[PDB]
Copies of this chain bind each other. A is one copy, B any other.
Amino acid sequence: AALVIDNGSGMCKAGFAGDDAPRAVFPSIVGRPRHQGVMVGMGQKDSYVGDEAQSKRGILTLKYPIEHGIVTNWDDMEKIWHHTFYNELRVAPEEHPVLLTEAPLNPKANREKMTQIMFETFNTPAMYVAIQAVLSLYASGRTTGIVMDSGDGVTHTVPIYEGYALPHAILRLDLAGRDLTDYLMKILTERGYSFTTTAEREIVRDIKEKLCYVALDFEQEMATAASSSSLEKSYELPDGQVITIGNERFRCPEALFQPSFLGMESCGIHETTFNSIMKCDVDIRKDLYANTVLSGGTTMYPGIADRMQKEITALAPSTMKIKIIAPPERKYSVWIGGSILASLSTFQQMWISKQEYDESGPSIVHRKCF
């Protein structure tokens, strides 16, 4: 077999290569005791990792190891990896090569240190760092196209033509699901509800993933929000407090579409996709439009595909039809790409060996891969 780990922001997905579903799914968080404990039966347990933290969320102060696709603290990640291999996978790192998924045009330190910790902290014969846009391209089954990959961490676009890549054409976008959560908490305050605590920060996120949905047209629903009848639903907190939301829930996902609410100059996800397409060759543009692939944590809400389709069709030229494919479970697609990628015999030759690292150094990662 082989080991596949998804290190995307918020959730850590782990499993075995060659399997349709991963063994371990838990959030990537480290919880420490903010408050002083006054008991005599405790082992004190200073650090908590994984879903255990979720149960003990109120007392603990949650910290995310990974911010904007960049890990702030390396030993927290190590605890997470230790937790994934032993607690749910119940396997040794030595046993198989391990595949990690990384976003395009990511900083050099993250690839070099990540391989260094994987080789030193967990002993493994070989490991490989892959790019999300290329893996989705193979999953799609197309040799030519444009891939917009938006993960929990950062949204990226990477067009491809017949095996040739265009670095200039690749555009990185700073909009992500986690960012929406910060916008969402910020938007709640003006309605009279305020959350300034990390444990309760998750609660708004929980609301966002099931209660929130994407409006066919933002302006029309907001307008009809004044006379809300079906736009308001009741959310039950563990606390027992009752929360009712209306137009507030659908205007949150909107910010990806309309960054102006955020306060940032940069254009939304549909405009950025168009920009990337323009950079690309005119001949290959036509299949780019008809095979747009949606992925990541924030692409889950229904109606995104319909809103994107009309918006891309309107701004884009009508010379060719616009088709968008948005399959369910796209959130887990990145992990899936990792498992399929590691399932290829050709790929095994390609893994970055421990011996190669020691002989040449960390800087060889850019040299070996794209």
B-facing residues in A181-203 (Cβ within 8 Å): 183, 186, 189-192, 194, 196-198
The answer on a CB contact under 8 Å between B190 and A108 is yes
Residue of B nearest to A199 (CB): B265
Interface status of A210 (Cβ within 8 A of chain B)? no
Interface residue from B191, B194, B266 paired with A196 (Cβ < 8 Å):
B266
The answer on a CB contact under 8 Å between A172 and B189 is yes
Interface status of A141 (Cβ within 8 A of chain B)? no
The answer on a CB contact under 8 Å between A168 and B263 is yes
Sample of 15 A–B contacts (CB below 8 Å): A105-B189, A106-B190, A107-B190, A107-B191, A108-B190, A168-B186, A168-B262, A169-B263, A172-B189, A174-B194, A174-B196, A196-B264, A196-B265, A197-B265, A198-B265
Interface status of A364 (Cβ within 8 A of chain B)? no
Tell me which residues across on chain B come within 8 A of A350, comparing CB atoms: none
Tell me which residues across on chain B come within 8 A of A172, comparing CB atoms: 189
Tell me which residues across on chain B come within 8 A of A265, comparing CB atoms: 34, 61, 196-198
Chain A residues with a Cβ closer than 8 Å to the other chain, count:
31
Residue of B nearest to A182 (CB): B168
Interface status of A369 (Cβ within 8 A of chain B)? no
Interface status of A45 (Cβ within 8 A of chain B)? no
Interface status of A117 (Cβ within 8 A of chain B)? no
CB distance from A164 to the nearest CB of B (A): 9
Residue of B nearest to A35 (CB): B263
Tell me which residues across on chain B come within 8 A of A363, comparing CB atoms: 226
Distance between Cα atoms of A169 and B198 in the complex (Å): 19
Residue of B nearest to A167 (CB): B263
CB distance from A366 to the nearest CB of B (A): 9
Tell me which residues across on chain B come within 8 A of A105, comparing CB atoms: 189-190
Distance between Cα atoms of A167 and B190 in the complex (Å): 12
Residue of B nearest to A166 (CB): B263
Distance between Cα atoms of A130 and B346 in the complex (Å): 61
CB distance from A79 to the nearest CB of B (A): 21
Interface status of A109 (Cβ within 8 A of chain B)? yes
Distance between Cα atoms of A106 and B226 in the complex (Å): 20
Distance between Cα atoms of A172 and B186 in the complex (Å): 9
Interface residue from B168, B192, B198, B266 paired with A107 (Cβ < 8 Å):
B192
User: B-facing mask of A307-332, CB < 8 A → 1, else 0?
Assistant: 00000000000000000000000000
B-facing residues in A91-115 (Cβ within 8 Å): 105-109
Tell me which residues across on chain B come within 8 A of A194, comparing CB atoms: 174
Distance between Cα atoms of A110 and B264 in the complex (Å): 29
Tell me which residues across on chain B come within 8 A of A34, comparing CB atoms: 265
Residue of B nearest to A226 (CB): B363
B-facing residues in A140-178 (Cβ within 8 Å): 166-169, 172, 174
Distance between Cα atoms of A273 and B263 in the complex (Å): 20
Tell me which residues across on chain B come within 8 A of A190, comparing CB atoms: 105-108
CB distance from A329 to the nearest CB of B (A): 31
CB distance from A206 to the nearest CB of B (A): 20
Tell me which residues across on chain B come within 8 A of A264, comparing CB atoms: 168, 196
